[PDB]
Design a protein around this ligand. Structure first.
Ligand SMILES: Nc1nc2c(ncn2[C@@H]2O[C@@H]3COP(=O)(O)O[C@H]4[C@@H](O)[C@H](n5cnc6c(=O)[nH]c(N)nc65)O[C@@H]4COP(=O)(O)O[C@H]3[C@H]2O)c(=O)[nH]1
Lengths: 175, 176
């Protein structure tokens, strides 16, 4: 049970800090960029949660149907990215996406020597990380309204899963 | 061994990305701020490693003898690197780029868990392990390793002997 620690640290050390002042930075972004961040439910931080823990080494979104646009503006600095989402080769939405990056730590633990093992143990920990985070956010409702958790599991083969569809799905059911 | 995972993650997802570009941002900083970042061995990222894992909730340095001045500018991630002046007997004694190795906060949280996630002793061990693993990693990338220094210590939980500012100055003054 380190998913506990990971979630508390990711809340206390990051989410706790950025969520309160997200609307103001979003305001500044939309003043700067002529209201590019737009569409209902688009004024929120979408935190990607791949249970497979497939966060890229660079921690950024890398997907051919997801194109980076610009950053949110800014006592320290935050690196929140705004992407346009493609659907059938057309811009279908715009949103702020980022990976819940401590999932990377879980993938790393699954590669360790022989001890740090089991894809199954990692999956379970990721779920645990997720629900723990959700349980934390439940108690800070005003700030919880500033983000949404997109939980899924990317398969390791086949072509069925689409991260961009997954996001569009989540946005289109803002209920 | 979550220390192993934490370290590789801290390297791959953070250090690997900022260390090669630090000197350029340092150049930019010192064009802006008239060579404030100054003193031999001050052009480096000092990473604080408290084995106690006493990283503050807000992740910043919070010490009465360490005063924030300004941020490093950006080189596309955005990076948050703080430059502080160190005080010695009420007088500015040096300037440096300091930050906590923040994965250590994860270890503190694991030690507070329910009853299972336990042991100040198991956290100390993992912290050292995190540290030595990270050292092993940096050893392989010597050029970028030259851009940072690990400041490893253990802040006691009581008494007044420990001083983070003196710790830093000792590290800067005795850099050979
Ligand atoms: N991904 C990662 N980053 C690390 C790690 N250790 C230290 N950092 C860095 O600490 C820098 C400063 O913290 P921050 O300004 O408050 O702003 C930080 C900080 O609030 C946050 N952060 C702190 N701890 C964690 C954590 O345990 N997990 C995650 N996902 N984010 C964290 O990431 C924010 C933004 O990132 P940056 O601006 O680029 O720069 C951040 C962040 O990248 C690590 O193990 N993994």
């Amino acid at each position: 049970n380190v998913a506990h620690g990971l979630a508390w640290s990711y809340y206390i050390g990051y989410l706790r800090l950025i969520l309160p002042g997200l609307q103001a930075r979003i305001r500044m972004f939309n003043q700067l960029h002529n209201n590019m961040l737009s569409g209902a439910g688009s004024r929120r931080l979408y935190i990607l949660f791949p249970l497979d823990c497939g966060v890229p080494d660079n921690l950024s979104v890398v997907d051919p149907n997801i194109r980076f646009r610009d950053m949110l503006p800014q006592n320290r600095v935050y690196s929140n990215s705004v992407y346009e989402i493609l659907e059938n080769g057309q811009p279908a939405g715009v949103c702020i996406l980022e990976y819940a990056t401590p999932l990377q730590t879980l993938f790393a633990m699954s590669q360790d020597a022989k001890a740090g093992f089991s894809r199954e143990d990692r999956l379970e920990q990721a779920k645990l990380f997720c629900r723990t985070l959700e349980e934390i956010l439940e108690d800070v409702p005003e700030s919880r309204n500033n983000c949404r958790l997109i939980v899924y599991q990317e398969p390791t083969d086949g072509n069925s899963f689409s991260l961009s569809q997954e996001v569009l799905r989540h946005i289109r059911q803002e209920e």
